[PDB]
Structure formats: structure tokens, C-alpha cells
Amino acid sequence: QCVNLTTRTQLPPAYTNSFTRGVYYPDKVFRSSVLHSTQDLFLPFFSNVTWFHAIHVTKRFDNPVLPFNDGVYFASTEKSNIIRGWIFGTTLDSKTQSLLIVNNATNVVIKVCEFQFCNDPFLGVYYHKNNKSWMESEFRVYSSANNCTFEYVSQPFLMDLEGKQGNFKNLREFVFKNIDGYFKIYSKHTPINLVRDLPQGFSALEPLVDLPIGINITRFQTLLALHRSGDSSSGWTAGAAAYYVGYLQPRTFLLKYNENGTITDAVDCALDPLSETKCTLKSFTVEKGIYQTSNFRVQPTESIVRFPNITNLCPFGEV
Amino acid sequence: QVQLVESGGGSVQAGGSLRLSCAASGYTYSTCRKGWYRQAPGKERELVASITADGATYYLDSVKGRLTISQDNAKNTVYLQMNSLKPEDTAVYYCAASVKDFTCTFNSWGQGTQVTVSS
Amino acid sequence: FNATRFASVYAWNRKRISNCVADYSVLYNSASFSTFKCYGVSPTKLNDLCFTNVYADSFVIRGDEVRQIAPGQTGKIADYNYKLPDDFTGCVIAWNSNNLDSKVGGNYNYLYRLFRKSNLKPFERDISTEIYQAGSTPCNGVEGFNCYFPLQSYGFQPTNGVGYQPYRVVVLSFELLPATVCGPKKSTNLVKNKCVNFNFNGLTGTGVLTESNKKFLPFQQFGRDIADTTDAVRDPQTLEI
Amino acid sequence: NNLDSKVGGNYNYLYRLFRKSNLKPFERDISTEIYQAGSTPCNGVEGFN
């Protein structure tokens, strides 16, 4: 059923820096033109992130299975609608409920059942060179569907499945958790004219869904379709795409919104002395002066319990 | 009482098809469930297929898809259409008719017809 | 419930309804039943209650066993046919199908399971119809002496006796943990221009309600002035602020 | 029990159990009005519901 193909490079992990991303809308409230102080599980900004590449060139076709520690801050760059969704679970062998969020060639599909998914699975569209055309031809991920809970269908549409040349010009930022049973799913996307770099700017991620489900999932991975001529093990492509991912931390931020209720600025109180003073101000904006923020605090060490010299114990042998 | 007579058995090469017929006689109004049992050499009797009066049917996993059970009320007969026969299918097949009033067993059994599938 | 068909006699069928909104009083408000038995809760007063799922045993019986299939009961079922949890959490409703489960001229399907040697764990489904053995020698797949069917026939007729009468039976043990289905929400019209102690989209509070000029986000429900104090309400529904 | 428990169960003692409201403490109320879990009032043939 599954066959995990060779011709895949082994590469050391590449890395980025997270400058001013990892922002999301927590509630649904108005908040208009306000500085509001608050914490939530986030990345820090100006942190330092891994990079993943799936390049044609091997094809550096990367499909490792990636954790669900605390959530995920997911940045994805696409070119041909190559990633279609992601697949979360612990065993990915039907032993534990796992879900697939995926966007197959007509629809957004999500079926939750205990599917003994494969290790690094996928399906491959079959291309035609005589007359250029692609349609999905394979479906090799899963095996069994016995326990199923959730379901969701999308409005049937049509996608081109054509592979464009040139630069990347598709920014897809996602944040997924399943914390406090809340399957807590933040995402949007945005058009670009770069090739491969990290942009500055804002944008906070919107929610998609908040399911109070309460499950244990510890890993997750993507589900993406691809195109084929040149054999089953040679005549396919990884597809020009890159996708980069983060693990969230408890950080307290100062909250901008606009003249509307849209987030217009934020900081990292757990990063920087000056972000923390800005927390203390409640203000973006800093006057000349010096400002007392907190009191430092000297770390415990070498926890010790030291009884005295021992002298006279029971003669248990006498018993 | 009820009388069950089987027919249509014989020898068929593997991959062929056979249709068994069970004609019910006597007091037909008493019959309730009709189904087909088979007893392969050296094995125990098993329920291959049964059909309800309403038309509800169920089959064993081995025969499901290959075998179909139907009824002809006017003919007072139940049929077992066997398609894509395998050598495993070789056995004596019994038409079984339940009695309505009685502890609802297969109160009436047919003589049994032998179907042999050559390889 | 309005379902036309229930399972066979030996094959009590489990059904669940979840991931929707259910109005439970109308189900209570039918009065077309010879059996309406809810334990722990009334057939009513569930609309303010949300549950994850409930499992319904579906089958066709005679009227004599409209009682016999229920938790906390004892008899041939509790030993030989069907055991149910001692801590049952739910309800049993049923309604007669006396003229409705026999076919004209007699459904020539009729067979019946009461008894079976085996044993039953709580909420276990058994269908076997094997000849009953109390132990003298192996039956060798043969009925006859000391190899006898442990399942008398009911034998349903359109004029079935009340003990004989077919009944539409539903056995509900309620499952809750992520509840899905409750009553509608309860609720009222939408009214404006009056100082009111409100429940805004489940948000209980007080104030005067008036139209909002504010521009809410498509999911945006409410807005709170500084100090986290509500400022406007989106009609939860027409999404009008 | 030695003075109030009887063979078969002392059903000699009987109590109303349901109320249309929450009852105040130390308020004895023994009215025998037939409880109405309807819907339709019965006025008066006891039975189901």
C-alpha cells in the first residue's frame, strides 16, 4: 500500500529568524485603538527558526513527522497549490484518533478516523506530455476507518494543478494547536513578489475553528499532491514550495488594534528589557527618562540538604 | 407441514455459475425464514445466505458478492445464484425453511443437493 | 423515532444522533407511545442540556417484552440474553407496532431469539441462534437429542396479543463528556431601545440596546470599552450589530 | 427500624416527592393535588405521566 521512494537528499536543517511574526486574534471582542496587556502561548519575535525546502533540483522531498508539542506557528510558501493540508496524530497507525486536514483537487477535505496512515505518505497526480494535462491518479496514505468523530465538506471547486515558473509570490502563515481540548487553528494567506526570504511587516493570524475536543496528539505532518509522467519512483516532482514552522512559548504582549479592532502593533515582553518597559508604560511610546520595570532575581543552585555527622545507629544484626 | 425439495446441483468447472432451486410444498403460509446451508466434506454446517419475507438478506463473508438469494412467491421457490464458483464452494447445500408457530428454528430441511466445482 | 424500520429480534441495533441541535420536548410531546420511560431525567428538560451522544437500541419485539428490555431488570434476559450497565444513564421510550411488524399473510421471515446459553456483559449485542447444549456430548454441528434451539418463536400476527403485540422500542443511554446537541436556545425576538437586563448571544448582562454604527469583523461578536467592558453586541445571527 | 421497619417495606408511610417550585424550610405542605408533568391537565384518571 505505501512505498516510500528513494532519491531524496539528506540535508542538515536550515534556519531563519522570526522577526515580528507570530501574532493571532485571541477573542472575538472589539478592541479599537487600544493598548491592552496580556499573555498567551506565542513565539517570540526576533527569535531564530528552522527553514524547510522542497526543491525540484533528489527533489529534497522532505516529509518528516513533526511534533504537536504546544501548538505550531506555521509559515508556508507555495507556488502551485502543492501542500493541500496537514495530518495530526501520535501513532498515525489508527491506534489513536488522528485527523487529516487536506485540500484534494476539488475540495477542502477533512475526515477524522483512526487511519493507519503510512510513515511518509502521499499521492501523485499523473501528467500527460502528449497533451498537457494533470489529474490525481494515486491515493496512498491510509488503510482503516473504524472510529470516526468529525466531518466537514467543502464546496466543490476546480484547481489548475499547473506548475508555474519564477519566484514565490504566496505567503501562507498558519498556527495550529489542540490545547485545553480547543483545536485552535489560526491561518491566513497573502500575495507576495519575493522569491525566498523572510518579509518584515505585520500580520496577525485569524482563527479558523476552535473545537473543544480534548484529545492527545503529539506529532503532525503535511498532506500534499504532486505530478507524474519517468516512473513511479523517478517521474515525479517535489514541487517548488517551502514551509517553515515554530513552537509557541508563553509570552506577554502589549496589544495594538486600530481605529478599527485590527491588531496594529505588538511586542515581546519575555524577550527584551525595552519591550518590558513598554509593558510597564502601557504605551507604545517612550519618553526620555529612566523607568523601573522589575527587580532582578538570582537563580537558585545546587539544592542541598546536609544532615549532620552520623554517630550511633541500630545494631540490627543483634536481632 | 412443509416440504422442501432442492434441485439444480451438479458439477461445474471453477469460474462457472450455478443456480440452486428450493421449491416449498404443503402449508406455505407457515414458512418464515428461507436460507441456504452448505456442509463441505469434513466441515460443519454453516449458514451461507438467508432471506426475509420482506426481502432482507444476509450472506457469509466467503460467499458475499458471488452468491445471491432471491424468492419467487408465485413459484413458492427460493433460489441461490452462485457465480464465480471456487473449489472451496464444493459441498452439499441444504434449503432450510423455518416454521412460523414453532421455536423459530429451521423446522424444515431439504434433502440437500451436492454441488462440486472442479479445478 | 419516526423511523419506519427497527432491527430484527436478535440484533438490537445501536443508533446515535449528535453534532446538531435537537428539540427534546417535541419528542416528549408526541403522546403516540405506549412506553415513555426516562430515568435520571424527564423526557423534557433536556433542551437546556447538551450531550455528546446517546445510543439507541433498535429492534422488533412483542409487547410482552416492552418491559423485558430495560436496565435494572432481572430475568431470562439478565442471565442468558442481554445485560445492561448497572449505572445506566438515560431513557427508554417505545411505541406499539402491533399491526405494523407483521406482513400480510404472515411475513414469511418470522424467526425469533429469546434465550441463548452464553453470557451477557452490560450492553452487549448477541445474535447467535445455535442449538442450546447443557452438556452430554458434542453436538458435532448436529441438532436433535440434547441439541435444541434456545429460542422459542414469538410468531407475530396482525392481531397479535398484547404480550404478542409488536412494539417500536428505543433504548437510550446518554453519553456526555465536548457536548454537541442541546436545545435550540429559551431565546426570544430582537428588541431595541430600552434599558434591559439582557442575555446577549449567551452573554448575560444589562443595558440599553440600540443600533450600532461600528464595523465588526465577520466573526466579531462583541466589543468592550477599555477595562474590558462591553460596548456593542452583534446580533449573534443576522450578524447585525 | 426495630419499631418502624416492617416485612415487605413500610409502605404505610408515604410522602409527596415533586414540587412546582423550591420549597421553603420548615414549611409543611401535604396537599394531594395530582402532579402534572403535562401538557394536558387530567383534572383525574391517574395513569401515565
Numbering used by the authors:
A (entry chain A): 14 to 70, 76 to 247, 252 to 341
B (entry chain D): 1 to 119
C (entry chain C): 342 to 518, 521 to 584
D (entry chain B): 439 to 487
Sentences from the study reporting this entry:
In CoV, the virus envelope spike (S) glycoprotein is used for virus attachment to host cells and membrane fusion, and it is the main target of neutralizing Abs. The RBD in the open conformation engages the SARS-CoV-2 entry receptor on the host cell surface, angiotensin-converting enzyme 2 (ACE2), which triggers S protein rearrangements that lead to membrane fusion and virus penetration into the cell. We selected a panel of nine nanobodies (Nbs) from dromedary camels immunized with the receptor-binding domain (RBD) of the S, and engineered Nb fusions as humanized heavy chain Abs (hcAbs). Next, we used cryo-electron microscopy (cryo-EM) to determine the Nb binding mode to the RBD in a trimeric soluble S protein without the furin cleavage site and stabilized with a T4 phage trimerization domain, as well as with three proline residues in the S2 portion that enhanced protein expression and maintained its prefusion conformation.
In the S-1.10 complex structure, the Nbs were poorly defined in the map because of the relatively low number of particles used in the reconstruction, likely due to S disruption upon Nb binding; nonetheless, we modeled and refined the Nb bound to one open RBD. Neutralizing 1.10 and 2.15 Nbs from group A recognized the RBM, similar to class 2 human Abs, which bind the RBM in the RBD open and closed conformations. Nonetheless, whereas the 2.15 accessed the RBD top, the 1.10 Nb approached the RBM from the RBD outer face, and laid over the NTD. Conversely, the 1.10 Nb approached the RBD from its outer face, and its CDR3 laid onto the RBM valley, whereas the other CDRs connected to the mesa. The 1.10 Nb is distinct from 2.15 or Ty1, as it did not access the RBD from the top, but on its outer face, with the Nb tip connected with the RBM valley and the mesa rather than the ridge. This agree with 1.10 Nb binding to RBD variants bearing substitutions at E484, and the lack of binding to RBDs that contained the L452R mutation at the RBM valley. In contrast to the 1.26 and 2.15 hcAbs, 1.10 bound to the variants with the E484K substitution (beta, gamma or zeta), but failed to bind to delta or kappa variants that shared the L452R mutation at the Nb epitope according to structural data. Cryo-EM samples prepared with the S-1.10 complex resulted in low number of S trimers and the formation of S protein aggregates, perhaps due to Nb-mediated S protein disassemble. Nb binding through the RBD outer face and close to the NTD of a different monomer could weaken intermonomer interactions and facilitate S1 dissociation from S2, such as described by multivalent Nb binding to the S. Notably, 1.10 and 1.26 fully inhibited RBD-hACE2 interaction at 5-fold molar excess (100 nM), showing that they were the most potent inhibitors of the SARS-CoV-2 RBD-receptor interaction.
